[PDB]
């Protein structure tokens, strides 16, 4: 729709950040669920509450206190969003993706996105890390898209391609790095499907999503990838399989957000060490290279 | 979206009803198409036009005059909506489901939903009664959901599960009761898929819906089930197969709302006797149990 | 939704056109991409910029200057829209389809729609002309429909059927006419699927769309067909396969709008001659029959 944000608004917000921190991030990380503790490994960290940054969507999301943190992670200068915005909260896609365009204006070149998702692929287990190789944007099928409305030429083209959204070179490096970590479990990889939420899927819906080729289901990230790729950002992400969805009517139980503990505690730790290692493989700047 | 209705609005409406009728319903029934004559078997019935109840969405739906009726059906005190609201009419999901939350505030514990649907499953025949076992909420895939926006803790949780939406015990009782009625035709059961409407599906669309596992297609009910399950209501419903959809391009005809007569006359009668019998199987209160 | 246009607005716009041109079109053509040069074969042509016609949606679409042209094409009086409106531009469906209802009020009886689409069907080649036999309206699954809101009885019914949307007799005539042209390539025919856009599909999304039975993917036309069929217009259309979508992650490239040249130049020429020939096969009026 007619995005309430004009190009100038993004620039004003980016200019404000540049005048309050000496940090100049090259990488931006959007933390979903488990990775919320990643902020603790950042050195020379400076925090900003989403509430003090003009034009920034303020949020009351149940999970992580809305704050943007600048700092150095494994020799790389980066900025991370500790907590994201979701459509199910009431925000339209142009609000949820506002920070992505600001990152581009700060000079960021790579965006790393993480989330927690239900595993549809039968071969997945709770705690599995799935490298997002592709996605299915269901809201986009009905015209719900962050790029809807008049295109801002200063950010990208009118009809951007999405077939190469997930940087191949990074997925290659992620696999090598996982091997060096000596993990007993293999690093999964697959396509993520986004739904609006906030309720959890029914058995019928999960079987449908699986037939369509989806490996994991979630309620975010996709709009952020579209906007990131639209403005030229290199993109790669990970889903933390927090639960194995039930595909049988003879359900031994039902879904709930207990995932904060499940995976969010055990698999999240590894996920942090993982992203920290990857900072050294991202091309140019940041480190002494 | 930001639901125009605040918690207080639901309470004000519920308080108004309590001060105008001595009736205290334990069960709520939403009548779709055929079951519109169910109001005639209610004893000690009191009628309210949707127009006289504050905050209630007023409607001009082609089918049944908008009125809420309180009364006793087979020893059970209940309230029924003679006519529902539809998205295709212009109403957003928070408007269509407003009555469901009021029912909860009146102390209702069970919601029975009925509708008329096109039979996708090849084994169905016009006049078939299909017990809704599951559903596929297509509008929900794009973020069109009655729960969209900030959650009202007083009604339910942020991420409610939908896998157990259709009460198993009631589906068990419905089957036993159907047997006692001595019906020649079996009681069908399956998954209902909702579409926005108001136009009827194309051959291509029907084959798609069927492949996805849907047994019947309709333009309502799903949002009501989501909200009902969100606030703790026990739920069970029935679809009246008013027509067998054409899956061939060599179409012997096209769809139209003649269904008011077809099934709406013949199968509706049985559907009424059916729901009347079930009132005695619903757990606790109402009757002398 | 509550369409901002009242019946009177359509009539006022139709009355304005009737008072500015002596032309009385019997056929209306909506040009998509390649067919944009069709306006050049019209005799006794009169042009109107969308900007000078009251109530008409003004546009800034990248492709063809928004103008409505009246004239005679192969002995048939018709009106063509050189450039259409798209949802991805910000327009809701009631805005995009406004001209379709005006055409009906001018006395038009047949609507011909054309577009450019990605070929999903493996048997298609760039430059292929695909007769649209059916469609899958994805935005319609979520309630995004030009007929959403209170029905205007003066245009059509509340629940119009779509199974016979693409006039069979015309598809029969189109095939005969193609044979007379002596084309080396066969005239394709299939179902078109619409997506919101404006970004191009991912590999995962294309495989999904293909599994659902779609032969070609596009970002328009469907809403126009729904409204046309709702008001009684005979409808038939063509998709110009401007590109073969990549269904493999080992992508030799990515999508982009270079299609203006590809097909838009080579296959468009034939497409024009094609529509010009068909003008003589459309039933009654226009010509001396």
Swiss-Prot record, chains A, B, C:
Q: Which reaction does it catalyse?
A: inosine + phosphate = alpha-D-ribose 1-phosphate + hypoxanthine; guanosine + phosphate = alpha-D-ribose 1-phosphate + guanine; 2'-deoxyguanosine + phosphate = 2-deoxy-alpha-D-ribose 1-phosphate + guanine; 2'-deoxyinosine + phosphate = 2-deoxy-alpha-D-ribose 1-phosphate + hypoxanthine
Using the record's annotations, give every residue carrying the modification N-acetylmethionine.
1
An MF annotation (GO) of this entry: guanosine phosphorylase activity
Q: Which domain of life does the protein's organism represent?
A: Eukaryota
Instruction: List the signal peptide residues.
Output: none
Q: What is its main location?
A: cytoplasm
Query: Which GO annotations describe the biological process of this protein?
Result: purine ribonucleoside salvage
EC no.?
2.4.2.1
Q: Which family does it belong to?
A: Belongs to the PNP/MTAP phosphorylase family.
- Report the function annotation for this chain: Catalyzes the phosphorolytic breakdown of the N-glycosidic bond in the beta-(deoxy)ribonucleoside molecules, with the formation of the corresponding free purine bases and pentose-1-phosphate. Preferentially acts on 6-oxopurine nucleosides including inosine and guanosine.
Query: Under what name is this protein listed?
Result: Purine nucleoside phosphorylase
The organism of origin for this protein: Bos taurus
Name the gene behind this protein. Answer: PNP
């Amino acid at each position: 729709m007619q995005n309430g944000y004009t190009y100038e608004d993004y620039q004003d917000t980016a200019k404000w950040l540049l005048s309050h921190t000496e940090q100049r991030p090259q990488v931006a990380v959007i933390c979903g669920s488990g990775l919320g503790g990643l902020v603790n490994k950042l050195t020379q960290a400076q925090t900003f509450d989403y509430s003090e940054i003009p034009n920034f969507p303020e949020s009351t999301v149940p999970g992580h206190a809305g704050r943007l943190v600048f700092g150095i992670l494994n020799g790389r200068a980066c900025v991370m969003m500790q907590g994201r915005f979701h459509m199910y909260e009431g925000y339209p896609f142009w609000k949820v993706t506002f920070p992505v365009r600001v990152f581009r204006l700060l000079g960021v070149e790579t965006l790393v996105v993480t989330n927690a998702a239900g595993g549809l692929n039968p071969n997945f287990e709770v705690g599995d890390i799935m490298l997002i190789r592709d996605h299915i944007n269901l809201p986009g099928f009905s015209g719900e898209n962050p790029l809807r409305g008049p295109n801002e030429e200063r950010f990208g083209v009118r009809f951007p391609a999405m077939s190469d959204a997930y940087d191949r070179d990074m997925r290659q490096k992620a696999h090598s790095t996982w091997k060096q970590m000596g993990e007993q479990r293999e690093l999964q990889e697959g396509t993520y499907v986004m739904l609006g939420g906030p309720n959890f899927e029914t058995v019928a819906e999960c079987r449908l999503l699986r037939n369509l080729g989806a490996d994991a289901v979630g309620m975010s990230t996709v709009p952020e990838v579209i906007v990131a790729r639209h403005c030229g950002l290199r993109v790669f992400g990970f889903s933390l399989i927090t639960n194995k969805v039930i595909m049988d009517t003879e359900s031994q139980g039902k879904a709930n957000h207990e995932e904060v503990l499940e995976a969010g505690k055990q698999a999240a730790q590894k996920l942090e060490q993982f992203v920290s290692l990857l900072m050294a493989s991202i091309p140019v700047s940041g480190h002494t290279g």
